[PDB]
Structures are given as structure tokens and as C-alpha cells.
Design a protein around this ligand. Structure first.
Ligand SMILES: C/C=C/C(=O)SCCNC(=O)CCNC(=O)[C@@H](O)C(C)(C)COP(=O)(O)OP(=O)(O)OC[C@H]1O[C@@H](n2cnc3c(N)ncnc32)[C@H](O)[C@@H]1OP(=O)(O)O
Ligand SMILES: C/C=C/C(=O)SCCNC(=O)CCNC(=O)[C@@H](O)C(C)(C)COP(=O)(O)OP(=O)(O)OC[C@H]1O[C@@H](n2cnc3c(N)ncnc32)[C@H](O)[C@@H]1OP(=O)(O)O
Ligand SMILES: NC(=O)c1ccc[n+]([C@@H]2O[C@H](COP(=O)([O-])OP(=O)(O)OC[C@H]3O[C@@H](n4cnc5c(N)ncnc54)[C@H](OP(=O)(O)O)[C@@H]3O)[C@@H](O)[C@H]2O)c1
Ligand SMILES: NC(=O)c1ccc[n+]([C@@H]2O[C@H](COP(=O)([O-])OP(=O)(O)OC[C@H]3O[C@@H](n4cnc5c(N)ncnc54)[C@H](OP(=O)(O)O)[C@@H]3O)[C@@H](O)[C@H]2O)c1
Ligand SMILES: [Cl-]
Lengths: 365, 365
């Protein structure tokens, strides 16, 4: 009657290859408070913020506790994930066994096999049987459920919450075009009828990558060299002139020369949202853009925007679910690794960290 | 009879030391159209925007004409100055001989001895004879009149038009603390009861400069080294936290490390206005300020804000005039050079351009 679980913890900040370890703990299914719930993990991803959190440079972090049975206070890892409800308490009515859920708050700890929480720690997603019962053509996959709460919401809110782009006319431009976030943004731009330019780094198979992004929804795809080119500017001005619209919004997750390049390409009174810094270079803007072109440069942080705005989180999440159920939105694919007990859980996540350069990593159970 | 006048012109853009020259022309005082007026210059300053215009890097320029009697099209120089009305046409009623005026629009050309214009090309200021007859305790000086239309309005509008600072609590921070604009900003901060920090470059007489800026109205004065110091940081945070207010607004006219320094000192949701670039370095902001502190970076250009908002221009100007007449506001002093005919006019402005590092230069007549 006792469940054995595993959790990935750390007692001090550092590099994941140095500080992470696995802790065994036990959950009692026969002694649940009226409002308590037991969930079983189906999958959880490795995202850049999860790593910064372990490193000690992310300013939103779970508290360290002895709640997993350690002598020293330890913090769990992972902020998003997909879970299946095993059992509910006497007073729980919003959930039942077999339901799919995600955490309702950050800092929950998702790099583990099981969790004990209250009903209000979770948000219910439709599982495939419930989607089918409502007549929808598709139900979510594990990867779509386990990654729905961050990257799709980031892309949707940056496109719709700050500048109103006229459908069929106006443009946005984004760097980091091959990222998971960049790929959701191209799809959402397409579904809302926005034009867009994606900036990516050059590669030998460039033609296949351009074709993939255009199928996802980018209108044009350029390299960072063309982004740096004064000779190439006029052709970007011509794209925009023929649409009848303006370039009003810039999305930056790189920094450095890349952030300067996409800023220069906006029309007057443009806005840039910085949500990332993959290059480790700061944002650099010439003085003449601010004064003579009325350029504005601001920030975006989804964790801080949704803290006390449940309504905005809910309706954005419902729109993403609806697009998945109708087949109009596809997920950024993951490289999956199944935990089966022959290898400590913390080493699967250490491998995911080390191989993130190959693309988004997902641990499944 | 016939008035012989002099004007500083150029036929192509370039460095002022290379392209400027003096042109003689004649104004006929006996044949004035009903709405024309003749003015005689009393003083006109050398401002950074005047130099950029001559260089060809400022996107607001007077047209080149042969109206001064040149065979090739030539442009005049200078955007602000103080003039005295010599004569008015039959149908002019808003001005009379003896009045003090400034240009009502940019690109008028103020580096010259005389001008012929329409009544509506000018804005009337009270001269000292009129201040005294109207019972006011003080009247304008030449230097106060010749510099009233730009730098005092810039300081006022940056402090009141973008963020509402709570009197007696909130702070703003500015670099370029010894500039003319910086000094008007300190005085307005005192008159509106805003707290402020001024950042200046170190000097041998630092203590005397600090005393002067505190007398003008700055709450604290720091050097660029302290602005850059990780160790001095905590002392600036205490000044603000102990006041009960927040640092909401940063004013940047330097660029480079200096703009990074003052941005780091703001509370969350801070705003920076870039209105200058004296260091010729771009604005550089760490990615973490945009994301984790919700920092925003924008521009300010007074010519464009007041272009079609004459009501806001008028009321801002009237407030500065009132403060001068009541003795509550003092001018940023200038180094003055008198034109007397023994030395071509264009060489006085060439010397003024070259000596701008010594402080604001004013040519008087
Ligand atoms: C919910 C998810 C939130 C996020 O992913 S937050 C974005 C973190 N962005 C990144 O690109 C990771 C890069 N590395 C970093 O160190 C990120 O913290 C970072 C890019 C800010 C680092 O911040 P900075 O180096 O720009 O600023 P410092 O003052 O710390 O120097
Ligand atoms: C009404 C008055 C308006 C002004 O005074 S705004 C002009 C600001 N100019 C300065 O601060 C002088 C130093 N900076 C520059 O020269 C500026 O114009 C400058 C535009 C070359 C500075 O160069 P930038 O950093 O903007 O880079 P560029 O792309 O223009 O080259
Ligand atoms: N502010 C927020 O709320 C928030 C929330 C979630 C995620 N984010 C941010 O969004 C960004 C992307 O997240 P993600 O989950 O989509 O990660 P991801 O799937 O792993 O994609 C990262 C991409 O960045 C590109 N890249 C790496 N180094 C680069 C460099 N030096 N220059 C240019 N491009 C580079 C890579 O492109 P290549 O194919 O060329 O290698 C890679 O595909 C990150 O900066 C992340 O922190 C922000
Ligand atoms: N956007 C607008 O609407 C607008 C309108 C008017 C003026 N402005 C701008 O406002 C700024 C000040 O104008 P101003 O008329 O007051 O000029 P100013 O009186 O001549 O003052 C010049 C200032 O620049 C500083 N400085 C010069 N070179 C520097 C460097 N390399 N590093 C750091 N500081 C440096 C000087 O400091 P020191 O004492 O140490 O030499 C001084 O404080 C200018 O950049 C001007 O272009 C903008
Ligand atoms: Cl007097």
C-alpha cells in the first residue's frame, strides 16, 4: 500500500553535472487528506530556465526543504510537466483517477516519478478519451501535454498582448528562428494571418531548414549574415512595401549583433521584446534609433506576467488546446528518453542537459 | 535707408571648420510687405544639434537657397537665438519695435546679424522694460532669452510627460550632470520636489562642483567610477529605500558604460529616456534587466514631440518664463564672444564650435 518514488534534487547551486542526485521517498495512498491528490508523472522536459534555476542565476526558485526525507534542505527541479491522477481525497470533485494535469504554479518540481498535492496545485487537461468523447479529431500527445504550459504561451502572448498587428498586412521579425519558441511563433503568426521574417544561423543544409520554417509559417527566412548586411536592407524594405503593412514588432532571444540587426529593420515607432539571451551578449542599440526613429526596447517574462492573472493564463491555454485538438497546431518535437530503473533518474536529466544542443529533450516514464 | 547684414552659410555639408563662410546681404527697410518684420540679433548659442545639422547627420535641415545673394544654393545655420524687433509692416499688430523674440519654428537660421521674416515666424518674450512695467521682480538676461527655447523645455518635458514621480518621495537619475540640460533638470527637480542623483565625470575641483550642483537642486552627486562600482551599489540603494520612494526614471545623454550604470540603479518597471549620445557609444543593456526587472528603454526628441502640439509648447514655455520672472530659476551660464566687425562672423562660430569642450558658447552682437 506504499508507493516508492524518485526525485532529482540538489542541496546547493552549481552546474547540473556536479550538484544533482536522486532521492528515494514513499507516498502513502491509504492516508489522503480530504483535498489531497496523488499523481504519476508521464513526462517532463528540460528547458533553459530549469538549468538557470539549478545554476543560481534565475530569480524564481523553489524553497529548500527536508520534505523528501533528506537531512539537509534540498530543492527539486523542473517547472513544467504532464501527470496522470492516481487517487483523490474524500472532498475532491474537480479531478478523478485517469485525468491529465499540469502544475498550476511554478517551482513545483517535475523531475520525479510521483507527487502528492492538493487539488488546487494542478490544472486539468483533456486526456485523449475525453477529447474523443467531445467529437474532436485529436487528443493531446505526451509531448504536447508536457510542454504546453511554457513555450506556446510565451509565443502567443508576445504576439498579441503588446502591439496590435493588422491581419494580412503587418509584420513581426524574430531571431532564434529554429528554437522551440520561434517555431510556435511562426505557427501562431500563420494562424492569425501575420507576416514574419525569421533570422537563423547559416548551415550547410540551409535550403531544407528554410523549407521547414516556411511550412511552419514564416513568410521569409534570412541568415544572420543577411541580417548584418546594409546591401540587403532594401530587399527587406521591398517585402514590407508590397504587403501594404509595417514592421511593428521585434522578438529577441539572442542579444548581441543579432538584436541590433532586427531592431534596425522596424518601421518608426517600433517595439522590441527581449525574452532571451542565448549569445550571452547584452542588447546594443544605437542612440539614433531611440531619438530619430522613436524606437522602444522592453522585456518579457511569462512567469512574472501570469502571477496574478489566472484569467489571461486560462484563456491563452484554452486556445492552444483547441488548436491541438483540431490538428491546426503541431508541437516542437523532442528527443525522448524513457526511465526504466536501470539507470539513476538524475543521470537521465544530466544527459538531457548535456545534449540540449541537439534540441529539446524530454524524459518519459 | 539700406541695412547691411551678415550671415554664416554653407553650400555643402561637412565639418564646420571647413564649410562655413560669411555672406553679406542687404535688407530694405522702406519696402516691407504688410506682414513682414525686421529683427536684429542680440545673441545666439552653439548647440550640438547645430553642428550635426551642418555635418549632414541631423534629419531636420533648412533648404539651400540663393536668397542671400550667392550664385550657388546655400543654407543658413543655427536654430535658436534671441532677437530685437527693428520694424514692422502696416498690418502687424502682435509685435512692435523693441520687442524681444525667438524663432517659432526650427531651421530659421540664427547665426547672423539680422533677419527679415513674417510676424508668425516669431514668438514674443517679455523684455526687461516690460517685466519692470508689469511689476515683476526680475527680467530676462540676454543669455536667458537666447537659450530658453530648447534646453529648459527638454528638461521639463522629460521629467513630467512620461512617468509620474510622487513629490517628496520618488527619484530620477541622470548622467551628463554638468550639462546645461542636466542643470535645468536639477532645478526643476527641486521646484517640483523630486529627489535626484547626478552622475558626473571626476575633476580636480570635484568638491566645488558637487556643492554647485547641490545648490542647484541635486539630492546626491556621484562620479562615473562610483556609478560603475559593484561595492558602492548598496549605498545608492539605501538612499532610495530610506526615502520611502522609488527610482522610476533615468535620463541618458552619454551612452556606453554610463547608460548601463544608471539603468542598473532603477527599481523594477523603470524607464530610461535617451536624449543624447556624447560618448559616441551605443546604449548597452544587460539581458537580465529586461527580463527580471521589467526595464524599458525609449527615446526623446523635443522637435518631434512639439511638432504639432503647440498647446503643450506654449504652456511649457510660459512656466519657464514665469520662473525666471519670479527669480526661482537660474540659467546655465555661457562663455560669451562679442561680434564687433573686426573679425569675420563665421570665424567666431568656428571658434565657438572648437571650444565647446570648455562649456556652452554664446555669440553676442
Ligand atoms: C519561464 C522561462 C523563463 C526563461 O527562460 S528566462 C530567460 C533566460 N535566458 C537565457 O537566454 C538563458 C541565458 N543565460 C543566462 O545567464 C540568462 O539568465 C541571462 C541571459 C538573463 C543572463 O543575464 P545577463 O548576463 O544579461 O545580466 P547580468 O547582470 O547577470 O550580467
Ligand atoms: C533639438 C535638439 C536635438 C538634439 O540635440 S539630438 C542630437 C544628439 N547628438 C548628440 O548627443 C551629439 C553626439 N551624438 C551624435 O553625434 C549622434 O547624433 C549620432 C547619431 C552621430 C550618434 O551615432 P549613433 O550612436 O546613433 O550611431 P549611427 O547609426 O547614427 O552611426
Ligand atoms: N522570458 C520568458 O518568459 C521565456 C520563457 C521560456 C523560454 N524563454 C527563452 O526562449 C529562448 C528559447 O527557448 P527554447 O525552449 O525554445 O530553447 P531551444 O528549443 O533549446 O532552442 C534554442 C535555440 O537557440 C539557438 N542558439 C543557440 N545559441 C545561439 C547563438 N549563440 N546565436 C544564435 N542562436 C543560438 C539554437 O539555434 P541553432 O539551431 O542555430 O543551434 C537553438 O535552436 C531561450 O532564450 C529561453 O530562455 C524565455
Ligand atoms: N533630444 C533632444 O531633444 C535634445 C535637445 C537639446 C539637447 N540635447 C542633447 O543633450 C545633451 C546635452 O546638451 P547641452 O546643450 O546641455 O550640451 P553642453 O552644455 O555643452 O554639455 C555637454 C555635456 O557632455 C559631457 N560630455 C562630453 N563628452 C563626454 C564624454 N566623452 N563622456 C561623458 N560625458 C561627456 C560634458 O561633461 P564634462 O563637463 O565632463 O565635459 C557635459 O556634461 C547633448 O547630447 C545634446 O545633443 C538633446
Ligand atoms: Cl533689469
Amino acid at each position: 500500500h506504499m508507493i516508492t518514488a524518485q526525485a532529482v534534487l540538489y542541496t546547493q547551486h552549481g552546474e547540473p553535472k556536479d550538484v544533482l542526485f536522486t532521492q528515494s521517498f514513499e507516498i502513502d495512498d491509504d492516508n489522503l487528506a480530504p483535498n489531497e491528490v496523488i499523481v504519476k508523472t508521464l513526462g517532463s522536459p528540460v528547458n533553459p530556465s530549469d538549468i538557470n534555476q539549478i545554476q543560481g542565476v534565475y530569480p524564481s526558485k523553489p524553497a529548500k526543504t527536508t520534505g523528501f526525507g533528506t537531512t539537509e534542505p534540498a530543492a527539486p527541479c523542473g517547472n513544467e510537466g504532464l501527470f496522470e491522477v492516481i487517487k483523490v481525497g474524500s472532498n475532491v470533485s474537480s479531478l478523478e483517477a485517469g485525468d491529465w494535469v499540469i502544475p498550476s504554479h511554478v517551482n513545483f518540481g517535475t523531475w520525479r516519478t510521483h507527487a502528492l498535492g492538493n487539488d488546487d496545485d494542478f490544472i486539468k487537461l483533456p486526456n485523449p478519451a475525453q477529447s474523443k468523447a467531445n467529437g474532436k479529431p485529436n487528443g493531446l500527445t505526451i509531448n504536447q501535454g508536457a510542454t504546453i504550459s511554457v513555450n506556446p504561451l510565451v509565443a502567443y502572448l508576445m504576439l498579441t498582448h503588446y502591439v496590435k498587428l493588422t491581419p494580412g498586412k503587418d509584420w513581426f521579425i524574430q531571431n532564434g528562428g529554429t528554437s522551440a519558441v520561434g517555431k510556435y511563433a511562426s505557427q501562431i503568426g500563420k494562424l492569425l494571418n501575420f507576416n514574419s521574417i525569421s533570422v537563423i544561423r547559416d548551415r550547410p543544409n540551409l535550403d531544407e531548414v528554410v523549407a521547414s520554417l516556411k511550412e511552419l509559417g514564416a513568410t521569409q527566412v534570412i541568415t544572420e549574415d543577411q541580417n548584418n548586411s546594409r546591401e540587403f536592407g532594401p530587399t527587406i524594405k521591398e517585402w514590407i512595401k508590397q504587403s501594404g503593412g509595417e514592421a511593428k514588432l521585434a522578438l529577441n532571444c539572442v542579444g548581441g549583433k543579432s538584436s541590433t540587426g532586427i531592431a534596425r529593420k522596424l518601421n518608426n515607432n517600433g517595439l522590441m521584446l527581449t525574452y532571451g539571451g542565448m549569445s550571452f551578449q547584452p542588447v546594443t542599440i544605437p542612440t539614433s534609433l531611440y531619438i530619430f526613429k522613436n524606437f522602444t526596447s522592453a522585456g518579457f517574462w511569462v512567469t512574472e506576467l501570469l502571477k496574478n492573472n489566472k484569467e489571461l493564463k486560462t484563456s491563452t491555454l484554452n486556445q492552444i488546446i483547441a488548436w491541438y485538438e483540431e490538428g491546426k497546431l503541431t508541437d516542437a518535437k523532442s528527443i525522448e528518453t524513457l526511465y526504466d530503473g536501470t539507470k539513476p533518474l538524475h543521470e537521465l536529466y544530466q544527459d538531457g542537459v548535456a545534449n540540449s544542443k541537439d534540441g529539446k529533450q524530454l524524459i518519459t516514464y
